[PDB]
Amino acid sequence: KVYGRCELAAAMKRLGLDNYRGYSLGNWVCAAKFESNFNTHATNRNTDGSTDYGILQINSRWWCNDGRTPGSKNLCNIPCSALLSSDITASVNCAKKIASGGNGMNAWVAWRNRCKGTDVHAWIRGCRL
C-alpha cells in the first residue's frame, strides 16, 4: 500500500504515535516519508545480509526475523514479513520499541538526517487531526 500523507498521519494518530515518548506526530510521518516514501512494500537489502522492511524500513539484524539474516536479534519478536502489511500496526508497535531504545528516534538515519531539528509539524499541516 502507498499511503497519502494525512492518511498515514491519521493512522499513526489512532495508533498512538503523537507525542509517544515526546515525539510529535510529524516526526514519524517525516521518518516514513524519507525512509520509504510511505510505501508498505519497501524493502532494501544491505551488505551485511540484512534487509530493511516496510514503511519505516525496519532492519532485520536487530528488529525482526526474516529467516536469512546472520545473527538476527529479532527485538520486536516478529517475522519481517509482518511489517509489510497494508495495515501499519506491527510496524508501529515495533517502531515504538525502537524509539524506546537508548537512541530514541535517531535509530532512523533518515530521521536524524532530515527530520530532527526542523519544523516537523510541517508534515501534518493540512491534515485534520
Epitope: 489512532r14 509517544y20 536479534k73
Partner: antibody, heavy 113, light 107 residues
Framework: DVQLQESGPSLVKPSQTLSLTCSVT????????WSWIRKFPGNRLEYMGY???????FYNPSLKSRISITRDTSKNQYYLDLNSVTTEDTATYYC???????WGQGTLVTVSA | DIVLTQSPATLSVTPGNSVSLSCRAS??????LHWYQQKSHESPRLLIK???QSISGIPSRFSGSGSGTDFTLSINSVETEDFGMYFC?????????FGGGTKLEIK
C-alpha cells in the same frame, strides 16, 4: 518458553544496598529489553526502570538516584542495585520483559533494621 | 509524570455476569495503555496491549477499549478464576506508571 527468576537476599537494612538478580531462560538477554518493577503493600506497583538491547538504561526519577541496572550477557542475567535503602523500600520485586509478556514470580525483600 | 486512576477500587459481580473496569490518565497517552490481571501468589499477566490489542492465549472474554485519557477493560461473563486484581499501565511517557488497581470480587 521464556522464564524469568529473581534471587537475592530477603532482608536488607537501611543505608545498605538491596541487590537482586534476574536469570533469564529461553532467550538471549541481548535479544530483548528487560525491566524491574516493584509492588508495595498498598497494591502499589512502581516501574523502576529498564535496560535495552545494548545496555542503555532508563531509570525512574522517583528512585532518589540510588538505582543501577547492569547485566552479564554470558550468564543470561541482569541485576538491580538500589543504594541507601529504607523501610519505604519494602516491596515485592519482579523482573519482566519490557513488553510485559513475561514476569518473574516476584520476591519479597524487606527493609527495617 | 502521567498518573493513572482506576475506578472503582473494588468491583463485586456474580459469576457469569459482565463487567467493565475503568482506567483514566491525567493527560493523553494515545493508545499506549496496557492491561494486567494479578491473582493471589502469582505475578501479573498481560491481558491486552495498546488499549485494544489482543494477546496470544488470553481468553476472548477479555476486551479493552478507548483512547486519549479514557480507557476500559471489559470481561464478558466473568468466571471464578477471573476474580483478582486488575492493573492498567501507560507507556507513552517515561516514567511508565500503573493504575492503583481494581479488585474483582464476588457479590
Amino acid at each position: 518458553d521464556v522464564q524469568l527468576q529473581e534471587s537475592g537476599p530477603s532482608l536488607v537494612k537501611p543505608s545498605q544496598t538491596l541487590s537482586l538478580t534476574c536469570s533469564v531462560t529461553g532467550d538471549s538477554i541481548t535479544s530483548d529489553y528487560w525491566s524491574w518493577i516493584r509492588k508495595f503493600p498498598g497494591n502499589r506497583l512502581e516501574y523502576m526502570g529498564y535496560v535495552s538491547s545494548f545496555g542503555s538504561t532508563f531509570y525512574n526519577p522517583s528512585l532518589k538516584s540510588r538505582i543501577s541496572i547492569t547485566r552479564d550477557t554470558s550468564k543470561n542475567q541482569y541485576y538491580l542495585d538500589l543504594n541507601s535503602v529504607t523501610t519505604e523500600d519494602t516491596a515485592t520485586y519482579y523482573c519482566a520483559n519490557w513488553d510485559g509478556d513475561y514476569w518473574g514470580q516476584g520476591t519479597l525483600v524487606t527493609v527495617s533494621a | 509524570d502521567i498518573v493513572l486512576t482506576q475506578s472503582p477500587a473494588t468491583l463485586s459481580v456474580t459469576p457469569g455476569n459482565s463487567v467493565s473496569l475503568s482506567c483514566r490518565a491525567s493527560q493523553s497517552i494515545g493508545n499506549n495503555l496496557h492491561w494486567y490481571q494479578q491473582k493471589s501468589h502469582e505475578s501479573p499477566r498481560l491481558l491486552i496491549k495498546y488499549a485494544s490489542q489482543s494477546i496470544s492465549g488470553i481468553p476472548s472474554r477479555f476486551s479493552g477499549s478507548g483512547s486519549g485519557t479514557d480507557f476500559t477493560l471489559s470481561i464478558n461473563s466473568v468466571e471464578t478464576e477471573d476474580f483478582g486484581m486488575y492493573f492498567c499501565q501507560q507507556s507513552n511517557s517515561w516514567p511508565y506508571t500503573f493504575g492503583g488497581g481494581t479488585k474483582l470480587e464476588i457479590k
